[PDB]
Design a protein around this ligand. Structure first.
Ligand SMILES: CNc1nc(-c2c[nH]c3ncncc23)ncc1F
Length: 312
């Protein structure tokens, strides 16, 4: 059956789902079961207009019929369901990670319920604006790294850090990490891995070497270059596949715009060190990014300003 409760009940129940009628745990007052049940189109209803596409399923705006509260729902098949989806975001203290409202299995699918962020993704903002000004880029990279810092401290690796997996609030002030389908647990180094976006992959993952929290740091600076240039790393210079180039070529520091401040350029360099032992952690890179943001003048640029042309 489907009960109200707390994160540990959901995670241990997530292990039984990932190991393989209506069961789960709702972690918030907004979503309420009726007679210990919670079923699609019966106790809650999906909206027709889709929110987007996740890694292992489409994301929809839903609405609880009793309470009237709306949330995001990602339907993931049991055949591709990973317990790390919920363990990466269940009961987290950080505001820079999209909070889990609950997870409920209904037959062959698992319905993951998450808080709505109405501002769209950072990827959509970059597509619309063309590219973001330096202070806006630093600001969002700073908040992404606060989220990563917190995840890494809890032995969780995101595994697909990019603009599409960073949601924004309506006013652009708050940013948070979403989509934990590539999430991996860390031991006192990584375990089993699902591949993220090729352009954001660290050299250690392509070389087949042992990976750790520093993979998300590499990806976060690839996301920084994307924000600044309007295009992913590598793609202006090479055509796919990129794995042999990522392994052999120098890190894409040449894609740092020359307009950038000293501390911004230096921050991107330390985050894009090829050897993960030489590469800064999330917490360390976050410090550099905050200091670089202060150097440039803080967050001055307007929320959805003019269209800056991407690099060609
Ligand atoms: C589209 N990809 C994903 N999106 C969200 C998500 C949560 N809350 C949201 N609010 C507004 N848009 C989107 C979302 N979660 C996981 C995903 F894989």
């Amino acid at each position: 059956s489907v009960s109200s409760g707390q994160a540990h009940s959901l995670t241990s129940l997530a292990k039984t789902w990932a190991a393989r009628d209506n069961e789960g745990v709702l972690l918030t007052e907004k979503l309420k079961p009726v007679d210990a049940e919670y079923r699609e189109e019966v106790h809650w209803a999906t909206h027709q207009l889709r929110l987007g596409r996740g890694s292992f399923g489409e994301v929809h705006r839903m609405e609880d019929k009793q309470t009237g509260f709306q949330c995001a729902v990602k339907k993931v098949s049991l055949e591709v369901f990973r317990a790390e989806e919920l363990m990466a975001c269940a009961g987290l203290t950080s505001p820079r990670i999209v909070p889990l409202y609950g997870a409920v299995r209904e037959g062959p699918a698992v319905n993951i319920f998450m808080e709505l962020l109405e501002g769209g993704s950072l990827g959509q903002l970059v597509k619309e604006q063309g590219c973001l000004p330096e202070d806006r880029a630093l600001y969002y990279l700073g908040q992404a790294l606060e989220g990563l810092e917190y995840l890494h401290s809890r032995r969780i690796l995101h595994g697909d850090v990019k603009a599409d997996n960073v949601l924004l609030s309506s006013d652009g002030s708050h940013a948070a990490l979403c989509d934990f389908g590539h999430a991996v647990c860390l031991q006192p180094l990584t375990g089993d891995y699902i591949p993220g976006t090729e352009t954001h992959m660290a050299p250690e993952v392509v070389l087949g070497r042992s990976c750790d929290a520093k993979v998300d740091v590499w990806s976060s600076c690839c996301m920084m270059l994307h924000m600044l240039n309007g295009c992913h790393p590598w793609t202006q210079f090479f055509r796919g596949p990129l794995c042999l180039k990522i392994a052999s070529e120098p890190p894409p520091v040449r894609e740092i715009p020359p307009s950038c401040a000293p501390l911004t350029a230096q921050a991107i360099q330390e985050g894009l060190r090829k050897e993960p032992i030489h590469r800064v952690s999330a917490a360390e890179l976050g410090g550099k990014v905050n200091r670089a943001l202060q150097q440039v003048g803080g967050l001055k640029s307007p929320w959805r300003g003019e269209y800056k042309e991407p690099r060609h």
